[PDB]
Chain A
């Protein structure tokens, strides 16, 4: 009838959802531990959240199989794209805003004060578009893994990273199939999720274009972000 999820697939899903909740919290109480101040809140919150993405990625099955420089290539390229997903995941429809518990840095006003107000509407549009997909934590977690293992320029072993990604892709396909009783609409749900990969390429580019704009205006990023976003 409907191909069931193998024990490796069910274990992978439970593993990713478990550590997604653990790396969800931009905490360790580092909010307390860690017009210039508005831009410094954004850069400090981003550093903390990027470090959660790196630890989430380093714990993904397959991340240890690839070369070290291939790991740096993936983490440098997926960092901004996964940041769009994490912020979009906290969209609240009732207020049409992003609620990040510590709702200060990623609010409209802090972005307006820091001079990056022109970016808010492009972000919220993506938030609305992603919110309407109604992804559960399995859809969202598997998508995050698929973003990390995407084919990036400069990979020494692109075929290897593709084989790793295919394992998460196939897990996502079978999960949707079992959740929809092999309905033809499984392709629609699956295809729309893969469509997000296309759209976050634009957002990551727009993020790269702001990093370029900051250098021309001589406003500098914290060195952790400068190295990961390839100044």
Chain B
């Protein structure tokens, strides 16, 4: 676990995934309660999420010592955390569009597009829209969360040894425990003045979990997730998807 470090995760963040072999994790089903006038916009948002999931699979693959895990464990870890990582990245990206007595109005789903709060109200997802921007985006800006802590939390989210069905739980424990050491050391060497920062950062993770669970309710309600096929998509993506390219 010596290669696993915040510095390596920082240089991995710059790597760009090659043209994503499309895996339809999210899609507008044949019979869907999404009104017909909005199926095309919703479908485009699913295609956007699918690309980000594909970039997430390629990111997790090259994480130090991740590919040395059992292949079934690698699938379960990505299967259980891809949603939270999407929301966490959304919340990280949305900080720029914070105030660019009213709540935040814009959510950055991807670099080249934002979601307006009125579009979330029309979709009936206003509450979860506000939770992402306040409990995550606004809190991370107030917390002055830097990129080093962001990539560390992403690794901590992914390397969850409590995922049901793992065959080598301790091999995942060793990886997450190394991340706890890395995050605590970074807070002591660079953020030495701030007390309780290590705890303050990890307190976003349960908030991220609840929001992720609420999103899964909406996604399943509108029959947007292909849950019966996600593990299969993760299997093929880890094996066949092209490695990222360093822009340098």
Q: Which residues of A contact B (CB under 8 A)?
A: 122, 125-126, 129, 150-151, 153, 166, 169-170, 173, 184, 186-188, 190-192, 194-195, 197-202, 205
Contact = CB atoms under 8 A, between A and B. Distances in A.
27 contacts: A122-B164, A125-B164, A150-B206, A153-B127, A153-B131, A166-B196, A166-B199, A169-B196, A169-B199, A184-B185, A187-B180, A188-B177, A188-B180, A190-B198, A190-B199, A191-B156, A191-B183, A191-B184, A192-B177, A194-B199, A194-B202, A195-B162, A195-B205, A198-B205, A198-B208, A199-B209, A205-B213
Interface in B140-199: 156, 161-162, 164, 176-177, 180-181, 183-185, 195-196, 198-199
For this complex, into which size category does the number of interface residues on chain B fall? 20 to 34
B131 to A, nearest CB: 7
A187 B180 CA distance: 6
A197 B203 contact: yes
Contacts of B229: none
B1 to A, nearest CB: 12
Residue of B127, B156, B199, B205 with most partner-chain A CB within 10 A: B199
B210 interface: yes
Contacts of A197: 203, 205-206
Closest 5 A/B residue pairs (Cβ): A187-B184, A191-B180, A197-B206, A201-B209, A198-B206
A198 B180 contact: no
A47 to B, nearest CB: 25
Residue of B135, B185, B209, B210 with most partner-chain A CB within 10 A: B210
B176 to A, nearest CB: 8
A62 B167 CA distance: 43
Nearest to A166: B196
Given A151-B135, A166-B196, A188 B205 contact: no
Interface in B196-236: 196, 198-199, 202-203, 205-210, 213
Contacts of A126: 162
A219 to B, nearest CB: 21
Contacts of B156: 191
A129 B162 contact: yes
A173 B213 contact: no
B201 to A, nearest CB: 9
Nearest to B195: A170
Contact of A151 (B164, B202, B207): B207
Given A190-B198, A192-B180, A201-B206, 10 more contacts: A125-B164, A129-B162, A150-B203, A166-B199, A173-B199, A187-B198, A191-B176, A191-B180, A191-B184, A201-B213
Residue of A126, A190, A201 with most partner-chain B CB within 10 A: A201
A173 B210 CA distance: 25
Residue of A173, A188, A198 with most partner-chain B CB within 10 A: A198
Contacts of B184: 184, 186-187, 191
Contacts of A129: 161-162
A203 to B, nearest CB: 11
Residue of B131, B195, B198 with most partner-chain A CB within 10 A: B198
Given A184-B184, A187-B184, A201-B210, A151 B203 contact: yes
A231 B206 CA distance: 23
Contacts of B208: 198
A167 to B, nearest CB: 10
B160 to A, nearest CB: 8
Contacts of B181: 184, 187-188
B208 to A, nearest CB: 8
Contacts of A195: 162, 202, 205
B162 A199 contact: yes
Nearest to A125: B164
A11 to B, nearest CB: 20
Contacts of A202: 209, 213
B69 to A, nearest CB: 18
A57 to B, nearest CB: 18
Contacts of B180: 187-188, 190-192
A205 B217 CA distance: 11
